[PDB]
Write a protein that binds this ligand. Structure first.
Ligand code: NI
Length: 262
């Protein structure tokens, strides 16, 4: 550490992430990255993802693991500022890229994604897990923004969407955090922070790229109904060979969950 070092995430923002479970980073990537990823999203939104067989309409267009086939998604994960931001908020010395994806709400056909946190969808366990949600369009409320229950990552509770457990009380409006965003801004949220996203009622699409990241204290855990949402034997891609031979408790590191420079 040098006396001249500056970090994109201020120490106060690092502390806000721990307190609230979510922060917003303005200008997370520059406009060159924005244009490159707009093209990559527009290219991949029309086809099933690498893990699907080449379609029912959801509340958003979504696929995962685009970096396996697309060099621009791969470059965003490994060459852009995003892995540096993830390392800064997790405060970890190791960093794994867990998965990428897109979520696009098209005005013709989208809807609300209900209250949930992300942990129950991923075969991991441990505190240092976060999602970076990179906006590629203007995102205010009318555009289908995300909103968060402040501090809910500290509750120690998993919430699958529409699971309706008795402990979960609908939040009061003043308990809900959100931001206005422009293309290139990102949200970074903890895997236990409960969030939802409202309907895009605007005339323009709401494109976002997601990257998921894990740090020092995380291990593999084959919880039910988690990504990749199908038996591993049904996936032929070589990156998954190293995951098939992995057992719970072991570090995440493998070809599908690769280590990234810190
Ligand atoms: Ni989510």
């Amino acid at each position: 550490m040098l006396k001249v070092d500056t970090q994109k995430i201020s120490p106060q923002q690092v502390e806000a992430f721990e307190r609230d479970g979510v922060i917003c980073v303005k200008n997370a990537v520059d406009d060159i990255w924005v244009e490159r990823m707009r093209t990559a999203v527009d290219k991949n939104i029309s086809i099933p993802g690498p893990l699907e067989d080449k379609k029912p309409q959801g509340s958003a267009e979504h696929a995962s693991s685009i970096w396996l086939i697309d060099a621009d998604f791969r470059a965003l994960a490994f060459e852009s500022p995003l892995p540096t931001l993830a390392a800064q908020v997790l405060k970890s010395k190791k960093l794994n890229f867990l998965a990428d994806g897109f979520f696009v709400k098209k005005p013709e056909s989208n809807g609300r994604i209900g209250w949930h946190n992300d942990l129950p969808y991923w075969p991991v366990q441990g505190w240092q897990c976060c999602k970076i949600w990179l906006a590629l369009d203007t995102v205010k409320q009318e555009n289908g923004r995300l909103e968060y229950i402040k501090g809910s990552h500290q509750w120690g509770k998993e919430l699958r969407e529409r699971s309706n457990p008795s402990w979960f009380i609908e939040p009061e409006p003043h308990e809900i955090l959100s931001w206005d965003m422009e293309a290139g801004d990102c949200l970074i949220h903890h895997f236990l922070t409960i969030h939802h996203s409202v309907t895009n009622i605007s005339s323009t699409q709401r494109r976002a790229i997601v990257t998921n990241w894990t740090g020092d204290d995380v291990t593999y855990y084959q919880r039910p109904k988690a990504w990749p949402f199908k038996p591993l034997e049904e996936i032929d891609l070589p990156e998954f060979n190293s995951l098939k031979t992995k057992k719970s408790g072991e570090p995440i590191d493998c070809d599908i969950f690769p280590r990234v420079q810190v």
